[PDB]
Design a protein around this nucleic acid. Structure first.
Lengths: 115, 48, 49
RNA sequence: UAACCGGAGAGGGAACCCACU
């Protein structure tokens, strides 16, 4: 009866936030992004896309507990540059990658069908 | 000394008395018997 | 291959069909707690079970 | 110049067997 329900992995409770931002006090230009109801599916591609940016000095993610549904992404960028704009540039590049991939996939599907 | 009800509680219809209460019943039974028997009869063998 | 990162594991993993059993010792037949529940009759200590 | 309701800690024991770490 202590089983949590299956929807709890992906549904935000009332009053929860999808995303939370906290500045990292130990070093300058570093920030921690806490995402609720996400997992490795999103954090791994976000980390790998952040690591293509040379202005990003540190980037990593973790799940604090598997039974919990949270993910933490720590980003540190060079001064003149913000981890927040680094994050949103990684998102808007990764969406561009997926859109290009989708277009080329459907074109190759049509070409496989009698071509 | 006979101990009180808290020492030998009686449960309700499994009332069922304690294992100690039945022994106390045997005590007062043979005590009343020996008392009246030595009082009237004084057989001096039954008393043994 | 790793299910999280996709990188293949450096060691190679031993894997195959093996006949497992399910024993009757669940956890839901064993979990129990207490906070000032019922009380024994003769001495006023808690119950057992 | 108006309108109906109401009560709560129960509940025993001994013996034997099986099983768990």
């Amino acid at each position: 009866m202590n089983a949590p329900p299956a929807f709890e992995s992906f549904l935000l409770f009332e009053g929860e936030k999808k995303i939370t931002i906290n500045k990292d006090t130990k070093v300058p230009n570093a920030c921690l992004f806490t995402i609720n109801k996400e997992d490795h599916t999103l954090g791994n591609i976000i980390k790998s896309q952040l690591l293509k940016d040379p202005q990003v000095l540190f980037a990593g993610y973790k799940v604090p507990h598997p039974l919990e549904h949270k993910i933490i992404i720590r980003v540190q960028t060079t001064p003149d540059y913000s981890p927040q704009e680094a994050f949103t540039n990684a998102i808007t590049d990764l969406i561009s990658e997926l859109s290009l991939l989708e277009e080329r996939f459907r074109v190759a599907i049509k070409d496989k069908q009698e071509g | 000394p006979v101990p009180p009800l808290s020492v030998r509680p009686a449960v309700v219809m499994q009332r069922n008395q304690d294992d100690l209460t039945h022994k106390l019943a045997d005590i007062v039974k043979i005590n009343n018997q020996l008392r009246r028997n030595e009082q009237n009869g004084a057989a001096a063998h039954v008393i043994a | 291959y790793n299910g999280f990162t996709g990188r293949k594991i450096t060691s190679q993993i031993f894997i195959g069909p093996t006949y497992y059993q399910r024993l009757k010792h669940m956890v839901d037949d064993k979990i129990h707690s207490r906070a000032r529940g019922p009380i024994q009759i003769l001495n006023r200590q808690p119950m057992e079970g």
